[model samples]
Target: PVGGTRSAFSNIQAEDYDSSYGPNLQIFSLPGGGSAIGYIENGYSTTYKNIDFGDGATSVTARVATQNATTIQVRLGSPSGTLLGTIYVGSTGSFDTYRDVSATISNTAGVKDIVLVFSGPVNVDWFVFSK
Candidate 1:
């Protein structure tokens, strides 16, 4: 509905979130251009309103950067909402450097609010959901 058709993929910019939680969160400029949600630490969370998963998103890919390994929990609804999946991100040298991480998701269909819960310090550039 919100994404035009069912099973359609969605791409969302990290800095374009509807709301956010936690402290020390910052929006930083990307090296190649554009801005990203950065300064994320444990318990930091951000939400994007009304994301349509179409027929159901099977997987997600996120462009992230971090100095240490961490995980991003993809959730639906609230901060401690339905768990969709987890994106494991490894160290990418520095915060300016970025890499892609992917994970399979579950119970995702129709239109719902998407929340990204961080497990450690990491910078998110963008994320994509694919059927």
Candidate 2:
């Protein structure tokens, strides 16, 4: 958020002690329906601990929003983990604007942490993995 103003990614900071960190994402409330992960600062990342996909995951669907056009990559384990896929985030009128984008997972079948890494302006509500 160093562009012009500080972004709201701080909402998910576990503690002020972890203030000095990137990929500091947080769970936020959605306006229309359920909640989502927003306030994502550029290059901020987080792991979706223990995701189960039976045999192996085929694809990943994510509900997201962004004010700026960007590209998001969802890694498998860590930020440097296997490159599952890339999400092309286009122009979003406002943070309130939302859409569902998906990418194909190359590996990581059963249970694993979903590491999302990216230069934001992108917010995600949830992820659905195909078996």
Candidate 3:
């Protein structure tokens, strides 16, 4: 299993072949606990394959589409999947922007590979959690 980091969101590069790529902004407890947030930043049109969130956690994916320099619309859920939440990105570009996305998941226990698809090609970021 992977150890915890200072910030919930951690960037994984393609060269890090040994590492797992998924939503990094959200956190969840493993084994049996159920509660988590996962995020991905879509820099290209890519499909994250075989992404896992430890055990007993679900994930939500969103594309950060910038309407302007200071405004953005967080398209929630997968393009061919279910809708989770929506958040607004403030000028700060910090966690504060994530605070505006209105999204939520419930009863996510023993679940994995919960996908969040984007509508168009954009930056992807996600938050996932369990227990």
Candidate 4:
């Protein structure tokens, strides 16, 4: 699995206040069968909104607090605009103090990309994927 990092902003406040935040490093690839897995760490109150995985799959997922204060959301679909599945990471704070998330690709066919939409306030360390 390969991995990297990128900086993005979250519009949680609904204002134009952009902050320099580091998204978790992750690896992604497209094979004949198309399968994916992701790992995220130190993700606090942040949401990865509208992440494009670069295939035909577009999906989003995130981890958030039960009180709806911190959360992460990911969206995945096809290039033709077909919704594969919506993965959600809602309010896991009560279960654990730290934010750690993981996800797997269900439908491998027709998947193109993975889009992550994050909200709230937090820092992502890294992410990873496999064939």
Q: Compute the lDDT for candidate 4.
A: 0.32
TM-score of 2: 0.73
Q: Which run of 10 residues does model 1 get worst, by summed lDDT? A: 1-10
Tens digits of per-residue lDDT, candidate 1, 1-131, equal 55443222756888988899977898998667898998788999999887777677789999898999999999988888999899989999998888888999885778888899999999999898987
Best-first order by lDDT: 1, 2, 4, 3
Residue 101's lDDT in candidate 1: 89
Model 1 spans with C-alpha error above 4 angstroms: 1-8
After superposing all C-alphas onto the true structure, candidate 4 shows an RMSD in angstroms of 12.7
Q: Top model by lDDT, which number?
A: 1
| TM values, all candidates | 0.91, 0.73, 0.32, 0.30
Which residue runs does candidate 3 get wrong by more than 4 Å?
A: 1-46, 58-78, 91-103, 119-131
How many residue pairs clash per model? 1, 2, 32, 48
- lDDT for model 3 comes to 0.31
Selected candidate, larger lDDT, 2 vs 4: 2
Best by TM-score: 1
Q: Number of clashes in model 1? A: 1
Q: Note each model's CA RMSD in angstroms.
A: 2.3, 10.0, 11.1, 12.7
